[PDB]
């Protein structure tokens, strides 16, 4: 449950299925990005169409995400990593998430930045 | 693996400075959330400031909630840390993702929740 929630979400949001992607949230579900900034479920749509875009823009340049190994905890946070090398592999940027899980929704995506 | 990330943190909280520097590689790495990388050489010091910080938090009531700590099918050890003032008031959030190799600690990447 706990990973197919998060697992379905990316695939969705992969295959810009917006609706889907919306739907593994709560109503008070949130996403806190690197910096700390909360967006609630009234912000969240709007801003994951922001980062579909942004992901649009690294396959256009050749900038290349290499995502790896999505694992749940005894508790049922699940992780994943990403990795952001340009296009010669120099690594630009690493990316973690934590997703709290509750109710079998997205209570809180939690995003963690390598500056 | 995770046995690694075990004992490190056991004897880090131990102040056995000594098999806390053992489960690290010679080409092992620290990098914080901000990005700078710590070599071999600067581990040992770095990680002696690191306990210093955990003491000033339990004489000061703050107190760190640990969480989880668990290994991806590739061999990556995460675990994460919660640090709430006294009330519990979450002042920050931390985690930890463990790149290990040959039974060996290769990377300590910190990510900070700023």
Known sequence: ???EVVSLFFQA???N??????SCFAEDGI???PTGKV???NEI?????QQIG???DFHSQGVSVNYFDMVEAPDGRVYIGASVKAADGTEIRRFLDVFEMRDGKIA????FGKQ
């Open 13 to 15: 949001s992969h295959d």
């Open 39 to 41: 967006y609630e479920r």
């Open 108 to 111: 809180v995506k939690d995003v």
């Open 1 to 3: 449950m706990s990973k």
């Open 45 to 49: 749509k709007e801003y994951l169409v």
């Open 17 to 22: 299925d917006v609706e889907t992607a919306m």
């Open 54 to 56: 942004v992901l649009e």
């Open 31 to 33: 996403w806190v990005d």
